[PDB]
Amino acid sequence: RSVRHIAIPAHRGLITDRNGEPLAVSTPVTTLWANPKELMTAKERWPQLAAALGQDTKLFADRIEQNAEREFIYLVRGLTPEQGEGVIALKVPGVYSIEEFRRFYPAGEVVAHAVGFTDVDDRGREGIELAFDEWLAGVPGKRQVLKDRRGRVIKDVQVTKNAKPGKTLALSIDLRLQYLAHRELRNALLENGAKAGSLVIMDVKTGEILAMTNQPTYNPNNRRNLQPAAMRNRAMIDVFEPGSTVKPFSMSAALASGRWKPSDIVDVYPGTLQIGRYTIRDVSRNSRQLDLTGILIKSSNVGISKIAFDIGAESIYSVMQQVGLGQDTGLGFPGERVGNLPNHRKWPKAETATLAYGYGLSVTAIQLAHAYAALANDGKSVPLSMTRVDRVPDGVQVISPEVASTVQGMLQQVVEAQGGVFRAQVPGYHAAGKSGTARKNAYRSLFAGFAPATDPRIAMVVVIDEPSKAGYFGGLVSAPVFSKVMAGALRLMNVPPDNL
């Protein structure tokens, strides 16, 4: 006989989307356990118990003998009460049923990267489950018990400490947008025979992550084999060169310098520019004079480079740093990357140019979307949030409102002007953005933008990794994904059409 104190497990808090839709739920599962010390007195029952558990009689008997010094072993976890009652109906001494809490993920693969999962012990192991584990877990209680020599509970004397349930967590994710984004990203991977991809949607006014999806994905309810590539929340833990999608930030520095206006002209002939042993190269090389809007429409590396030499790389680096490229988001998601915005005491000419067109810098899809959100929100960056925001924190003015407004107009022209990225056009709305194509033979296709251009509400980033068909440019591959997902997201959010 022994007086002992045992734990009372706590109920893990519910994770919902922003509207209360369930994303991670603690559900009762029937667990069968046994005390090997008690089992030793009832050997004649073992074979029938083994048969009920679908185990070979000899392996089962060997298992009980190997664990003979233990007072607890799991027999089977995750049964239905009906299934557990069938094993309990054998009335084997030392066999017990228990209702345990186990996570179920109702949206499965659709929000797997964001939500993450719990381990077999119900502890946060990945994603939000890990990041907010303290909030979700609660505090176990304590029970006083009298145990016999075998460790069998003879009497339940009293509860010394009641368990405290974990707390509900409402994510910033809008499950309706998440499903839309998930489906369209999946479809684009098929259309392009691509290896992987990410799609992030952000509320430019609140800093909320409305959707965050990646391909490949996995079913968190059935993690049996268990692919590492499929479990990566690429939008947060993968870094990439943003390329031509950072040209609006180089343009912001240009307009803020006092030396450039959108109608100023740059001569980009013959579509290449030698700087020692390095050559800056444009894709289409049949231009001479281009205005600043033209440089973005035509995505001229030569044009943005000449502007960068004039204003200096320091001014460009400062805008990129202020909008958060290669900077800590403060989110603390497990494995989240900071990326890298290179710096120099004295910027050489080749490095000034490559910085201006997003070569040699590394960012995450969340960073790039946050930077476009700041630009869309008249230059004001609202802090990022993975949770529903009721009281919006104060933003920081990172680009002056006039400069941000001018760059927004230029980006609407990139989408709507003749010779522009027409595939990004959103039916019924004015949209703005910029595509990118990064050579990693192998390519990464990008589109970053926001809408409605007259009163921006949503920023979006589409990343398609290694499209394998003839088409690889961001304006061909990623821009139509932005169009479909932005049209859907605006309609779900009842955003009034502005292209009247």
Ligand SMILES: *C(=O)[C@@H](NC(=O)/C(=N\OC(C)(C)C(=O)O)c1csc(N)n1)[C@H](C=C)NC(=O)NS(=O)(=O)n1nc(C2=NC=C(O)C(=O)C2)n(CCCS(C)(=O)=O)c1=O
């Ligand atoms: C910006 O992203 C910039 N990328 C680079 O300079 C990088 N590589 O360039 C390529 C050409 C892919 C290479 O070297 O193989 C790069 C940056 S960081 C890194 N590691 N590599 C390029 C080139 C200036 N810009 C774009 O790709 N912009 S875009 O996606 O908007 N886009 N440009 C074009 C074309 N325009 C004109 C032509 O003649 C073309 O052949 C391609 N397109 C095609 C569709 C245009 S449209 C009018 O139908 O929408 C884009 O989508």
